[PDB]
């Protein structure tokens, strides 16, 4: 029983994807352990089944980005409570590092034609 969408073009295809996401998602609001195992794992593999070697590899790659981003957000959350730098704070013995703002100065390293006349 799926007669709702017989769309034949990408732009038309877009409406289906949105609606299915609207359909599928809210099922996670209830029964989350039931959601993740019974349905998410096996529908993904079944919809991955059609696609070719390259396409599945993109899907794995897309998922990994999801993993990385999620861990990043969680890492914001844990180190929200802890007042200073890394977990365990001053007990830790390990400090929080920073990033060098190079600008564009040192890539494929050379001498700098554009010297700065004045400093703010």
């Amino acid at each position: 029983t799926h007669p709702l969408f017989n769309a034949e073009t990408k732009r038309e295809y877009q409406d289906l994807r949105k609606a299915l996401t609207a359909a599928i998602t809210p099922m996670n609001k209830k029964s989350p352990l039931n959601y993740s195992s019974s349905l998410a794992i096996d529908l993904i593999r079944d919809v991955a089944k059609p696609m070719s070697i390259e396409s599945i590899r993109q899907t794995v790659a897309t998922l990994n980005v999801l993993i990385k981003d999620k861990e990043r957000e969680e890492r914001q959350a844990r180190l929200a409570r802890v007042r200073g730098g890394t977990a365990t704070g001053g007990a830790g013995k390990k400090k929080v590092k920073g990033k060098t703002n190079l600008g564009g100065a040192f890539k494929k390293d050379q001498d700098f034609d554009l010297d700065g006349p004045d400093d703010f």
Binding site: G98, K99, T100, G103, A105, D109, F120
Partner: protein
């Protein structure tokens, strides 16, 4: 802080560690003079600029310009470390002149 709240706690820390009697040790704050003519201040200002996210030459030209404007005879800052590559490299940023040897360096160079 409010009514010395941080410096109150800093007094409390030094009494417990150094086993002083409560009241025998007191802490005062003091404005530093001549801030460009202070190597420990200028290095620490430089250190925060790179951690806050300033561009590295901007800071290093910025701090050497500030010290020479503050009336120093010569200023000199060195940054050594890996910039963009595994092979590390030292930058030198100078202005004015400085002496290197003898008893005069002890009295006039702050490092």
């Amino acid at each position: 802080g409010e009514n010395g709240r941080r410096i109150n706690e800093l007094t409390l820390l030094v009494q417990k560690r150094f086993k002083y009697a409560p009241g025998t040790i007191v802490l005062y704050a003091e404005r530093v003079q001549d801030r460009g003519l202070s190597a420990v201040a200028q290095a620490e200002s430089m250190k925060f600029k790179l951690l806050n996210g300033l561009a590295i030459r901007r800071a290093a030209y910025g701090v050497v310009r500030y010290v020479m404007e503050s009336g120093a005879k010569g200023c000199e800052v060195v940054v050594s470390g890996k910039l963009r590559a595994a092979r590390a490299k030292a930058m030198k940023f100078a202005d004015g002149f400085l002496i290197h040897s003898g008893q005069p360096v002890n009295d006039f160079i702050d490092t």
